Amino acid sequence: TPWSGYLDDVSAKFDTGVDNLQTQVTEALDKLAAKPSDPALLAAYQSKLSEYNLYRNAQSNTVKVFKDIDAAIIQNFR
């Protein structure tokens, strides 16, 4: 927060793009852990975990792409 760059901004836009998934997934995790045989709890967990996976993958590739654009420009200062 005190200091953040452009890459930090690109990253943070996902962390606020998904409002509460960050907690929902941990919540569902222990609801299930209390009763791992309930079909409704299983189905509820499978989708939240899939959405968390895709959220992290999509976040990381973007930051890499921007790093490569910036390194390519900086290479030409000399």
Tell me which residues touch another protein (CB under 8 A).
1-8, 12, 16-17, 19-22, 51, 54-56, 58-60, 62-67, 69-78
- For residue 61, the minimal CB distance to another protein (Å) is 9
- For residue 44, the minimal CB distance to another protein (Å) is 15
Instruction: Look at residue 40 and give the partner it binds from a copy of itself, another protein, none, a contact being a CB closer than 5 to 8 Å depending on partner kind.
Output: a copy of itself
| Cβ within 8 Å of residue 32, ≥6 positions away | 38, 41, 42, 44, 45
Q: How many helices (H) and strands (E) does the chain have?
A: 3, 0
